[PDB]
Amino acid sequence: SGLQAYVDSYDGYEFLYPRGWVQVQVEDPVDVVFHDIIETTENVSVVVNTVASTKSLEELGSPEEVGDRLLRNIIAPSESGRSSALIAATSQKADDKTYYILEYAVTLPAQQRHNLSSIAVSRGKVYTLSVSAPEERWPKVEDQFKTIVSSFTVY
Amino acid sequence: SGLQAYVDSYDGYEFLYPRGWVQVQVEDPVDVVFHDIIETTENVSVVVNTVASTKSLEELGSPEEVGDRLLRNIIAPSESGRSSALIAATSQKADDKTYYILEYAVTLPAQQRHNLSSIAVSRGKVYTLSVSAPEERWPKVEDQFKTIVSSFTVY
Ligand SMILES: [Zn+2]
Ligand SMILES: [Zn+2]
Ligand SMILES: [Zn+2]
Ligand SMILES: [Zn+2]
Ligand SMILES: [Zn+2]
Ligand SMILES: [Zn+2]
Ligand SMILES: [Zn+2]
Ligand SMILES: [Zn+2]
Ligand SMILES: [Zn+2]
Numbered sequence: 009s010g011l012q013a014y015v016d017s018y019d020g021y022e023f024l025y026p027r028g029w030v031q032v033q034v035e036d037p038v039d040v041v042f043h044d045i046i047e048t049t050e051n052v053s054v055v056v057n058t059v060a061s062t063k064s065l066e067e068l069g070s071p072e073e074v075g076d077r078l079l080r081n082i083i084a085p086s087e088s089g090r091s092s093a094l095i096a097a098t099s100q101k102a103d104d105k106t107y108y109i110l111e112y113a114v115t116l117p118a119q120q121r122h123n124l125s126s127i128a129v130s131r132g133k134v135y136t137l138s139v140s141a142p143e144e145r146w147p148k149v150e151d152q153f154k155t156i157v158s159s160f161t162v163y
Numbered sequence: 164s165g166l167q168a169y170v171d172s173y174d175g176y177e178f179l180y181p182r183g184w185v186q187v188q189v190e191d192p193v194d195v196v197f198h199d200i201i202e203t204t205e206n207v208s209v210v211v212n213t214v215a216s217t218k219s220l221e222e223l224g225s226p227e228e229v230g231d232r233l234l235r236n237i238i239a240p241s242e243s244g245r246s247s248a249l250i251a252a253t254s255q256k257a258d259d260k261t262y263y264i265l266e267y268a269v270t271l272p273a274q275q276r277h278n279l280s281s282i283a284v285s286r287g288k289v290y291t292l293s294v295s296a297p298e299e300r301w302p303k304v305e306d307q308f309k310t311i312v313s314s315f316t317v318y
Contacts, residue, residue: 096302147251154306 011155014040016054021135024159025052026152049121050145052156055082055136064106065129071097071108074127078136079112083123090116105130105162113143122146124153128162135162166310169195171209176290179314180207181307204276205300207311210237210291219261220284226252226263229282233291234267238278245271260285260317268298277301279308283317290317 011024019039029042029052043051068074075097084092095111107128114121120143127136137160139153166179174194184197184207198206223229230252239247250266262283269276275298282291292315294308 151309 009155011152011159014042016040019054019056020131020163021054021137022159022161023052023054023137023156025156047142047145049119050141050149052137052139055138057134059129059132059134062129062132062134065108065127065134066106068129068134071099071110074108075110075112078110078125078127083112084114090114100126100158102158102161107160107162109157114140124157126157126160128160130162164310166307166314169197171195174209174211175286175318176209176292177314177316178207178209178292178311180311202297202300204274205296205304207292207294210293212289214284214287214289217284217287217289220263220282220289221261223284223289226254226265229263230265230267233265233280233282237291238267239269245269255281255313257313257316262315262317264312269295279312281312281315283315285317
């Protein structure tokens with residue numbers, strides 16, 4: 009609605025994101041980050057990694073199992089200061105692709121953050137779009153952020 | 164998606180609701196109730212009341228103020244056994260109409276229930292669609308129930 013397309017035919021995906029967000033240039037494996045001019049905390053981001061003959065997202069595990077691993081390994085690893093909580097893990101299908109959809113909280117010593125990610129495999133690569141807001145702002149942004157996350161298409 | 168239209172041109176409104184729900188015949192001011200065959204707890208319902216020259220929903224108050232009143236007077240009144248909690252109150256516009264959207268919890272000695280309602284005025288009448296699920300089931304039904312509530316159109 010007040011959203012704006014990002015189409016990346018190099019890397020093979022698109023999403024909508026809010027109008028008036030601007031891109032920050034970051035390092036691999038993160039492909040794009042866009043964040044709010046004012047609330048630079050609120051952002052969307054796409055990660056791309058590769059994989060040996062993992063044709064499908066279902067062979068990585070169930071969405072909960074994938075969720076657990078995303079948080080274990082990538083979002084709240086090691087001791088990165090930060091703790092995390094998996095809220096919900098579910099699946100969608102759009103075109104002939106399964107996406108896994110994960111909702112999680114992240115605390116970072118403490119500012120608490122609320123997130124939603126969509127993961128989908130295609131062409132030997134895993135694609136994770138992730139949107140994120142301060143806990144305080146979640147309820148206000150929840151329905152926009154669900155439109156962002158469900159606008160994610162991998163070719 | 165797996166939803167089915169109810170169009171009431173007598174009373175001047177429509178909504179989508181899940182396929183395989185069936186109608187229960189109830190008394191005024193409730194116009195329609197539909198509920199799940201198995202989980203007869205899960206339901207959608209439309210209430211219709213009249214009003215003297217209240218042309219608009221904005222003149223009843225802000226959405227929070229309306230929320231407070233819906234719960235005070237209609238959903239958890241008097242001592243009806245039951246207690247209630249207003250979670251969120253927001254507004255939408257579809258066609259040239261403002262709808263108020265309210266999320267609330269209701270406890271009933273105790274089974275806890277989670278609800279979402281849309282209220283809109285037109286033609287000297289207030290229209291409240293309300294969908295409701297056991298707390299346990301909320302997360303599973305949340306996104307379907309938001310499609311139900313946002314499919315509500317008053318003419
Ligand atoms: Zn790219
Ligand atoms: Zn902004
Ligand atoms: Zn687990
Ligand atoms: Zn949260
Ligand atoms: Zn919610
Ligand atoms: Zn009717
Ligand atoms: Zn059912
Ligand atoms: Zn109040
Ligand atoms: Zn609840």
